[PDB]
Design a binder for this molecule. Structure first.
Ligand SMILES: CCCCCCCCCC[n+]1ccn(CC(P(=O)([O-])O)P(=O)(O)O)c1
Lengths: 334, 334, 334, 334, 334, 334
């Protein structure tokens, strides 16, 4: 019907290779709510990425983005980023945002407000400590998990307990983000962006860029393995979060991406290829090829299979070997 | 128990490459009702297929087929087709037909009667307009969908609405038949049959067979895309139909073929391979590799994913490009 | 919490390539109960396998194994088998066994007692009759299915009937054991172990080992098909058992191995490769690659498909051909 | 099966009028856990109650009571209290405690250690301030609510948030205790124990025992009303707590006592009978006489009705009148 | 939060002795929506009540009441009725009305309009025919059931069919209103209000008020029984309606009142007390004393028991004996 | 609609003091199916009760009763029993029976047959051993439970596992029957019928009627307790049976009768009143007066409370005492 809503779903598919389908498969009111949430977040993220926008011009844009949702004519025409159209045709997006029930608007605007402050905070600095890593990931992904959880509950398709558990919801976002940051080292490196925590990579090399030098491959993998081990600590929370869900369309939406990130970490673990090029995500063992990620018991088994894929490859010599076995042990035994 | 019922199930597995498994997995009374229904339709389809049966003899056979279901000793012994066994031993099958609850008999006979009349009508002509294309598919597949739907409701395993909404049920069949007709262009051409609507292909070449000529590949593909674009229009109905199902065994039976057809059309889209041989039914992206077609939400996501696969390949120079984008856009927004 | 329980799960993953994942996915109490059960069975199985332990020395260990579960310090340090770790660190396993609720201990201890008795029984004899084959399989697998079934009922996650029907539960074990025995012919031969029932292979050759000879390949496949035909008889019971399950985690745990077994039999049927090396278990038709083994209707479909995969490869000449067709027919018509 | 567990349930019934039935009705694991938890707390409570034991001998016992749980032979044979049997045959109870899953053991032991510390602390003093009243109630009731919530979560029959939100769990306990303390004024005076906050009753009389004086009945009722108004403040939390529950057996166990407590408070409100004898708990209005406390909405309705029963009888002349009306309004509106 | 909303709930508990509790127990948005709806209906009803308000001054107030919802300052200070508080502080109510999601406002406003119209229409006449009785009940209660039903569907806590089947919803209001009109005969007569249909009572006496004269007690009871029999015809629709509800909080809200109405009719049937004083609503047999009205099957059982309580007390010589038996027979059999 | 069906429901209410309401509350096809099943069962029982019918005339009526269901004009106008109307108007009943789906007919027919056979057998003898007592109860109550269970499963409102479990369905029946037999001793004696197992009452008195003698009150009570103790042994099965149920209407129907019987036994236990006059069924403690029997945990709680009510009154001086405690402790610990 609505031509503007049509445009939004067009944008959703243009900017989301890996979420559009599951988003469109969401039950009732969640469909549009999550679609709109994805688009405005996409716009806020594009603003953050655009390095052609000076920091002093970017801070206000990020700080006041949540208010733009209520400015019918607001738009940004100076972006040179690839997803710039959601910024250039933002009026069509904010229009549909204002068409959403108020309970959804409140959540989306709140997350944008907080995300903007968070992104602005890290514009002038690099992630140093692992604690700072969690903070950054909390700002660009954790809040997304929290926001989404609140939309699920406000829609009534999910229990109020889902949106209430902000800790676990934050973990869902932290896990996906860390996995992406780890996987995209080379890509981010070649792009002038540094996301790997400094207090970690500085124990291996002088400059993050050195992991890009073939003569430092050994040290690079060791660091890679330490970061992966860090990310695995979020899996217990992920499993707890998914176990609470009761709506199938919501379960598929939340589970598939977590399982893909896990498959991603398994393929990247102790993999020199992370620093040479792209890594191929292989489908799995025999038991996995018999199930898919659409029921909780099956999701656990698929995760456990991937954990052993890793556990099996842990080199006694890796300086994170014990930590890696420990967290995988915890995941198995829980 | 019954040896004749056993023989029936033997013939089902011998004559149904892709439906036998799901049919045998159907709950209660539906199992036998659908088994027999499949057997008589296959027998009817074989009569129509056999080019060694003169039109003079064929017309009466197709018109009166439905009544043979009531004649204990009727059988045909002159078929040369591969599945002739269901015809030569029709008494065994007709015997089991008469054992079904009267309510299922009504549906089965009614569909055979209408289908036979329909097949007789197309013995002396080819499909011309797109309207005739729908009419033809209605007779050989649409009615099959209507029949099955009415059986589902009659058995009470599915809501009355399932059997009542004949339009949606018809679409389910039309989508599969059109998809198969598109896929099998080359196999049918070498077989002496023409199913592609003449009013569509005549606007590209002079004879349908011209598409098999390496020098016409481009026009051939433009026609392929137009027809695929025609088939895509049934998807909203397929989704509506599937979303109404409540029985797991019925859901698997109905959803599996649909998703298969959809992946098939995605693989054929703008693919020149359609005119050189058989086409690869890929595997999917990552989001799909983690989902199977057993719950509505997952099916929607898989369908939406295949829709994007097609959307990504729509060349701007294709004369149907705008139409193809249009229908996909509607499927996303609904 | 407990580090001993963690060690147990470490052992589970070290000794079980294909069960660990689905075992860890079991709901609540069944998780640790099945884990521990798997581990004690594995310890008992290892003692049994060890050919460096004389029969006189071995018998008392098998007979009293169930009692060692209550000897806090008991362990066995003289094994050279691959999984000896579970025997050498048995106190860690029995400690957790004694932590399980008493109702579970009773079931596990009872199965261990009866299994040791049976295992002792066969230390000095080979399998002769087919009836002896069922008894041996009952001892090393059938009882496992009965034990597990009693754990499911006692946990209340499954109906009281699952545990009470020892016959259906027994068939579950027999089917997996027979399938493995059939598949591992060559590996067992080169190991000095013989499990194919003598009365069956003797009607084809003088020494079971002759099947390993290239010149007897024809008689080999014939024996292979007769045994496979024997195994198929448990499938009706397998299906009955699975259709009573109501817990999803227990369903995945029970269904997946049975399906893998069936896929294996289909692959081995009329295959010379069984006598030359490892057999490649391949994908499946189209209808199967669309579904996974996590819902009863889908499992039925998957099974029916493999049945037809065997059925239509049955050589007219084969001595069992008519037996094979008859059981498959019974499986479909039920 | 085991007579020691049978014996435990025997003691559970001898020592609990209003809990034994609902406790035995708890699903799976929670049954024995809560049963044992109840028995040990009853044993601890019996020691504390016994004025026959000297303070310097009682303190160490209360402090180390948690440790006896691990001492197979520990037992107390010098008590004169009615429920002395649980102390005399503690080995039976501790044996079963040690048979519970470790996760339950640590929760129970932890609560017993903390409860003992608080109990010892209040041996030589009475409740002065209202803040002290919460503290005393925390030690003898709040912690039980926290302990039970942790057990519910650990059993997985309830959400992780139930065991995490110790504040809400605490309120469940404080509400029941305060109510009982308010109700049992007379009974306690005649027993030599003082539980009404001195800082509260002191503003009305000179000695708590004066409310027992006919001539002071009016000051009494006013103090009664002030304390009840204090208790009514835990209701919002009680509603928050009960709203998170998803297991019916746990819901019954938690909701029934809360509702009875609220009925008791409504009956005692501005009732002189409190200072004369036992107060009878009425029938409830018409709306409540068609609803039982087994589903949250019904429980809410029941609670709201009792709130009105109290709101209707608030005397303007009462000094707490405004406060009372306020808390009720907050409960109504949330 | 909002002090105005707080005030609204205070008035709800002031003006509604029997709906306040279940309204406050409604889930999410239905809570405030229904509370406000009740308040505005109460104000409209109180205007209509005030005899101190001349006809030509009242008619406008009734017709334009639906508009005062949007007049921020609108308020009436000349009422003497007991619930005058809601008219004097109407802006507070109207304010909260405007805070509701428009989809709710739309429903409420539409009902207040159609209600004021009908109310106006009856200001100068009495109820003559039975058809006119239905019309009057439609206006003061039927429309209410429609409005509430439409609020439920718009909240989506209930299926769309609920707000769709206006006839069934109308029946809900008609059953309650008739029951109350029957029950409050004396109270209404003493107030100068006559709601019993003249075409029914004039067959017994000359003036409806004569039923208040002890000498006409027998005739009064006969008429009483005729009207009750009339009311019973709405029961089939009440059961149908309730059976479609899916939200527990909505079910309690709807079922409790209906069950209390049926119990009231049962107590009033062939009961002289109706004309002497008030009637006590009876416990219930033994089967009912074992269930509450919170689940459909239980509600049906309660309803059937009350029908039998009536059926057994039907006097053969009663003028409606056959009609009464007929409808109760219809109810049992459906 | 059907006037014959209406008449059927009139007889249900006429002949069934307690079950009518809950039977009419059953979902869909179970309603009529169970109503009709109750009527035929009542007719068949009335034939048996009629002592004016000679044994040689009675026997054939019983054995062939099951065939009368298909004999349209069959009826019996010679009964003097109070419920004779069901026999005289049997054609109305047999008519509606034949309107029931064939699946329901089979069960009812099958049950009547087997029940008639069993009733004939006991026409000339008395219940001797307790094993005989179970046999009799099996024929007049147990089979009813087996039938109902099958009707539930056949209707598909209850899982197939309910119909299958015959031993527990039997226990359900045996418990009610034994309970009524124990309660109606006096009434059965003054009626010339003896049902207490001779082998048990013979160890107390010479003639079962002696218990009616005030001089044997002590031996009477003792015998009473020994029988009640006997009955209690069915409770574990009763609890297991109900725990399996999933449909609410079926649950109320099954649960309520069992709770009443339990309450009955509780009131009768060690109560002389049994031999003097009608026994009264008490309220039930505080906790129970808070729950109804519509959810399994509440039912367990109710049962457990009544069990305590009996355990409390077990006199050490009784000779069954140990047996009584033993069984109750088992019902509690399981
Ligand atoms: C599967 C749940 C039901 C299993 C038991 C079904 C048979 C019950 C046998 C007891 N029985 C015998 C006579 N009655 C009639 C009973 P009623 O219809 O309420 O008059 P009651 O006189 O109250 O005991 C019941």
């Amino acid at each position: 019907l609505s031509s503007s809503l049509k445009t939004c779903y067009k944008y959703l598919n243009q900017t989301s290779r890996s979420f559009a389908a599951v988003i469109q498969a969401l039950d009732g009111e969640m469909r549009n709510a999550v679609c709109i949430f994805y688009l405005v977040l996409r716009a806020l993220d594009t603003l953050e990425d655009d390095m052609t926008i000076s920091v002093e011009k970017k801070v206000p844009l990020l700080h006041n983005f949540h208010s733009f949702l209520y400015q019918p004519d607001w738009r940004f025409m100076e972006s040179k980023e690839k997803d710039r159209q959601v910024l250039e045709d933002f009026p069509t997006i904010s229009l549909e945002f204002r068409n959403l029930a108020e309970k959804y608007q409140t959540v989306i605007a709140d997350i944008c407000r907080r995300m903007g402050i968070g992104m602005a905070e890290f514009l002038d600095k690099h992630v140093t400590s692992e604690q700072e890593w969690d903070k950054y990931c909390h700002y660009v992904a954790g809040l997304v998990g929290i926001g989404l959880s609140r939309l699920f509950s406000a829609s009534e398709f999910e229990d109020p307990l889902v949106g209430e558990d902000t800790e676990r919801a934050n973990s869902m976002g932290l896990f996906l983000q860390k996995t992406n940051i780890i996987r995209d080292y080379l890509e981010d490196q070649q792009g002038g962006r540094e996301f790997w925590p400094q207090e970690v990579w500085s124990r291996y090399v002088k400059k993050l860029g050195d992991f890009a030098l073939p003569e430092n491959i050994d040290l690079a993998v060791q660091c890679l393995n330490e970061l992966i081990t860090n990310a695995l600590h979020h899996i217990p929370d992920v499993i707890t979060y998914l176990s609470r869900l009761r709506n199938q369309s919501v379960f598929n939406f939340c589970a598939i991406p977590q399982v893909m990130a896990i498959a991603t970490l398994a393929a990247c673990y102790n993999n020199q290829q992370v620093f040479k090029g792209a890594v191929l995500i292989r489908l799995g063992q025999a038991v996995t090829l018999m199930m898919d990620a659409t029921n909780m018991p099956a999701v656990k088994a698929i995760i456990y299979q991937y954990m052993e894929e890793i556990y099996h490859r842990i080199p006694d010599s890796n300086p994170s070997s014990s930590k890696t076995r420990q967290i995988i042990s915890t995941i198995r035994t829980q």
